[PDB]
């Protein structure tokens, strides 16, 4: 009936956005000015072997002190590693197994974790009694949690199934803002260093950028032909790198609303699983589905180097809040610090 006109406007406005992108499109200056002396081979070395895990490592996140990293394993344990001593500050077992995400608070006080339990558990590391206790078990999702990040010690954003990125106020235990609008379930989430805009990639091959003050979706980006796997903002906070199950990684700019640069090479046939910029943003440290991961020159689109360690696939990448080192959580139950 009248539904035809609705989709007609849908495609005509979508064409209008593509026309606006093409008209505003210009030659990308970076790879024309590839005249910056090549980094040659950056031999990053595996310096710490955080081998206290036994199951496959599914997520890792650094804190804001750049000393403690939370790491989640399949069996359902988090480990808070003091990376300068290879000692676990805490080892929190989980009530539910198959944890996919782990988040460190911006104060080092709380840790978030969740998975196919469809519940985001918040463990309060710091209490006068000693041991770690779960504070709130945030429930209300109907899909599996895939990524978790803290705005602060009382607000959290949780990408999960049901195509929702609901923001939870921890003390109340209820989500306030329901971010809906994806058609495939959202499985990645990256917080800006500005903590007002966050992007979420889904399995519908789209990354939508949302504003936390209201519930509307600010922007939508689509450059991938397969499901997005992970996202990481540029340090500046106006661009983000995104990988997919295809062997191509793509860097998007919010100021242009179109794909700004692409990274691919004929040798890799395995998908992306994690992405992470360095401090200067010239290094794209991305986690592959292959046993080894690679770093691109994040402006000139060439293979910067390799991380030739690990026995099985890497699953999560994380750089410090000061860029001093990087951790490669991987399925062989070893997190390796690279420096």
């Amino acid at each position: 009936s009248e539904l035809d006109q609705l989709r007609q406007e849908a495609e005509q406005l979508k064409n209008q956005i593509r026309d606006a992108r093409k008209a505003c499109a210009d030659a990308t200056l970076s790879q024309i000015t590839n005249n910056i002396d090549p980094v040659g081979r950056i031999q990053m070395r595996t310096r710490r072997t955080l081998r206290g895990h036994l199951a496959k490592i599914y997520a890792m996140h650094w804190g804001t002190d750049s000393r403690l990293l939370v790491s989640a394993s399949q069996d359902g344990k988090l480990i808070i590693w003091d990376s300068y001593t290879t000692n676990k500050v805490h080892a929190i077992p989980l009530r539910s197994s198959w944890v996919m995400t782990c988040a460190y608070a911006p104060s080092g006080n709380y840790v978030a974790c969740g998975g196919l339990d469809n519940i985001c558990s918040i463990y309060n590391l710091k209490t006068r009694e000693g041991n770690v206790r779960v504070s709130r078990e945030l429930a209300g999702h109907t899909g599996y949690l895939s990524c978790c990040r803290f705005l602060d010690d009382n607000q959290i954003v949780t990408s999960s199934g049901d195509t929702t990125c609901a923001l939870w106020d921890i003390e109340t235990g209820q989500q306030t803002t329901t971010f809906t609008g994806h058609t495939g379930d959202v499985m990645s989430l990256s917080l800006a260093p500005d903590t007002r805009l966050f992007v979420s990639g889904a399995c519908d091959a789209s990354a939508k950028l949302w504003d936390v003050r209201e519930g509307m979706c600010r922007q939508t980006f689509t450059g991938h032909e397969s499901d997005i796997n992970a996202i990481c903002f540029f340090p500046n906070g106006n661009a983000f790198a995104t990988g997919s199950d295809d062997a191509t990684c793509r860097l998007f700019d919010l100021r242009a609303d179109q794909e700004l640069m692409t990274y691919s090479h004929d040798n890799i046939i395995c998908g992306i699983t994690s992405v992470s910029f360095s401090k200067s943003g010239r290094l794209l440290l991305a986690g592959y589905d292959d046993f080894n991961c690679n770093v691109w020159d994040a402006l000139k689109a060439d293979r910067a180097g390799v991380l030739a360690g690990h026995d099985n696939r890497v699953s999560c990448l994380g750089v410090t809040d000061d860029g001093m080192a990087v951790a490669t959580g991987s399925w062989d139950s070893f997190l390796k610090i690279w420096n």
Binding site: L6, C24, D26, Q219, P235, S278, A325
Partner: protein
Amino acid sequence: MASNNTASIAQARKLVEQLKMEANIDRIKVSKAAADLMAYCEAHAKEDPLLTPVPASENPFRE
């Protein structure tokens, strides 16, 4: 009502409405965005530990 396919006109309205603010996104030249990223990388190319290795008394993985 399900006869109109359960008010799917509403969800189509919402998704197209999402497209209008994608038409309200003001689009800026790709060239200067590339220049901005390039200049920030060059301005932070000497303090990035992952480009030039700092010495063994500065990183906390050889002390």
